[PDB]
């Protein structure tokens with residue numbers, strides 16, 4: 001969509017693979033504000049609303065929290081302390097055509113300052129002077145809707161890069177969905193630390209003759225001591241016993 | 249509710265609207281030059297009418313804004329250029345005489361004719377036919393016939409046409425409340441609204457004339473020196489008591505005297521500075537020629553070329569069927585698109601032109617951050633003088649030995665530099681009197697204090713006095729030889745070449761003092777100094793956003809037109825020029841001796 005018509009959709013109930021962006025070897029505008037790229041994989045926040053728009057090359061720095069400009073004021077303003085990341089990459093091979101890319105428009109002027117994270121869709125014309133416009137272009141109408149022209153022969157400053165912005169903010173809604181965590185092959189018959197989904201402990205792993213119904217994740221036998229877990233990566237039921245210890 | 253916020257809204261609307269239309273016109277003009285096709289002629293007229301009508305609409309909307317209350321200077325310069333009415337003042341029945349006359353000039357000039365009268369065998373074009381007959385032959389009789397082959401067969405049909413042109417272009421100024429059409433061309437140099445920086449329009453005529461009294465004694469000795477080595481070849485064919493013919497001064501227009509060096513070489517026994525044989529032993533091509541030129545500029549400090557030029561532009565002459573013209577021109581398509589349009593050859597002239605046409609490109613991306621109306625040079629002389637300072641540095645023997653064109657053991661004595669410096673004197677000093685005299689005649693005839701019967705007797709009488717040329721044949725009023733030149737016929741301001749020289753040497757002395765070079769200006773170099781590169785690019789990036797009179801104060805510190813830093817360039821040449829002309833008759837009076 002256009003820069004002035006940026007969408008807002010919620011991403012939830014699925015795993016978010018941020019690691020595929022690191023090894024893509026195609027992004028040149030990988031900056032994060034208020035958070036580290038490495039530490040946002042295991043932990044995440046809700047409200048995973050994604051905003052998609054196209055920003056020209058000479059005004060990439062304009063789209064940033066705490067930074068003002070031309071696009072950053074009357075098209076899309078990022079509020080302060082925006083805990084998010086910006087990723088942009090060139091799209092000359094597909095998002096361009098000869099004679100000008102007459103598909104993207106934007107709003108250039110507006111009477112009042114825009115509130116953060118609101119979208120206005122209207123055909124209202126600018127009113128710089130006291131004399132109103134009666135629908136006919138004059139000295140004070142200045143129709144803000146203009147179509148940008150992108151060509152394959154444009155310079156690097158005018159090259160339109162494909163940019164996507166992911167927003168992460170903490171609200172009262174709990175139970176957010178985050179990215180994946182590393183898994184390691186199970187080792188058997190050894191006192192080995194384990195940390196499954198929600199529980200952890202130390203003990204020796206061995207085969208189990210007991211059988212589990214397919215909707216339990218683990219189990220305990222006596223005095224809230226876990227003795228059997230079933231990893232969903234294998235669909236196999238095991239026994240856990242504390243490894244050998246005692247007094248000499 | 250302020251005019252300042254109202255002007256920024258209008259220029260922001262125009263900048264995005266114009267760059268869409270300017271890119272369509274620049275892309276259309278590029279395919280015309282690159283490819284000649286039938287439909288492409290119709291295609292140019294389609295894009296050019298809606299582009300010309302767009303400027304008509306923007307000029308009417310800015311007229312209702314009053315100019316007596318805008319204290320901001322950034323939008324005042326933009327509104328002054330946008331409010332030039334141009335052709336909108338003319339009526340519909342008179343404006344149709346504009347597009348008709350200008351297209352007739354291009355088609356008439358394209359007709360090549362050297363067929364002999366009463367003997368119509370065949371005749372070819374200008375490039376294979378006319379250039380060989382002026383650069384190689386040494387016969388007086390046929391060149392005299394060739395002189396009458398164009399001024400009596402082509403200029404005879406311009407006498408009713410050019411006089412109609414100069415009575416209606418002069419009338420727009422009264423309809424635009426100016427004095428004359430000569431004052432209209434001085435509006436590019438007019439600066440108003442700045443305290444202490446104001447440049448009056450009439451002071452420029454006085455200041456230009458005041459600087460000419462030191463150009464004249466230098467040109468007196470140049471004509472005296474060149475007259476002793478030409479009468480050696482023609483003992484009884486030219487008399488050594490008068491002046492020289494006009495059709496023996498190197499080019500068709502006599503602008504550059506570079507072609508008389510081979511005929512009038514002082515000492516031809518030692519070899520000249522020629523490296524055409526040096527590149528062919530190592531098999532140099534077009535790619536390796538331009539690769540070392542790009543790394544020369546990035547060594548200075550200027551930014552390198554973008555990635556959308558090497559794989560997109562054309563460099564050599566492609567194919568056999570493409571007969572498109574490749575006259576060397578600089579292209580500014582906008583939006584980061586930069587191209588060079590020329591046919592490469594392994595020659596002396598094309599190698600220097602390759603450096604010359606890139607300098608205008610290197611000026612164009614500097615003001616790329618400026619708005620579209622200010623995306624230009626500071627004046628008409630800046631964009632030409634900026635493109636020539638790297639030409640002075642690239643012709644130095646030090647820069648030629650830096651790349652590796654010259655031999656590693658090439659001594660630099662006196663005579664190896666006098667040969668180079670006299671080549672520069674013929675292309676720089678020799679063009680100063682010709683630019684001032686021709687522009688001085690056009691300004692007063694547009695002002696109007698010259699009647700009809702005193703055009704030719706005053707034009708010829710200054711050629712005998714200033715230039716020093718005796719007319720080989722008397723000419724009556726039916727001739728119209730001053731209107732045959734390309735610039736005068738096509739409405740081009742020739743004053744941008746007079747201020748080009750006075751600017752390209754003000755910048756040269758200022759930049760060489762920053763690099764602390766110990767020696768004269770001819771041996772000075774710019775490379776291997778990163779302090780000078782960052783200093784220049786900050787002033788290059790300003791463009792027209794600042795006044796040009798502030799650009800002078802940014803380099804030399806003197807607000808006036810200084811004449812002292814030009815003789816210091818030629819002190820080694822002037823002391824040598826003074827000893828050979830000890831006994832020769834320097835300084836001509838009025839001379840009716842040969843053709844009384």
Ligand SMILES: *[C@@H]1O[C@H](CO)[C@@H](O)[C@H](O)[C@H]1NC(C)=O
Pocket residue numbers: 232233234235
């Ligand atoms: C998920 O479980 C299945 C069945 O045991 C297994 O084949 C698969 O390898 C596991 N995870 C993946 C996708 O590797």
Ligand SMILES: *[C@@H]1O[C@H](CO)[C@@H](O)[C@H](O)[C@H]1NC(C)=O
Pocket residue numbers: 320321322323
């Ligand atoms: C004049 O207008 C320009 C707009 O580019 C602005 O930057 C500058 O501050 C203005 N000058 C004054 C004195 O306000």
Ligand SMILES: *[C@@H]1O[C@H](CO)[C@@H](O)[C@H](O)[C@H]1NC(C)=O
Pocket residue numbers: 311331332333336337423424425
């Ligand atoms: C341009 O033409 C209009 C047409 O009437 C006129 O009002 C205006 O003064 C002209 N502008 C100039 C600078 O002559």
Ligand SMILES: *[C@@H]1O[C@H](CO)[C@@H](O)[C@H](O)[C@H]1NC(C)=O
Pocket residue numbers: 660661662
């Ligand atoms: C150049 O001439 C000067 C005197 O005019 C002389 O001192 C100098 O040695 C000459 N240079 C060379 C390289 O001979």
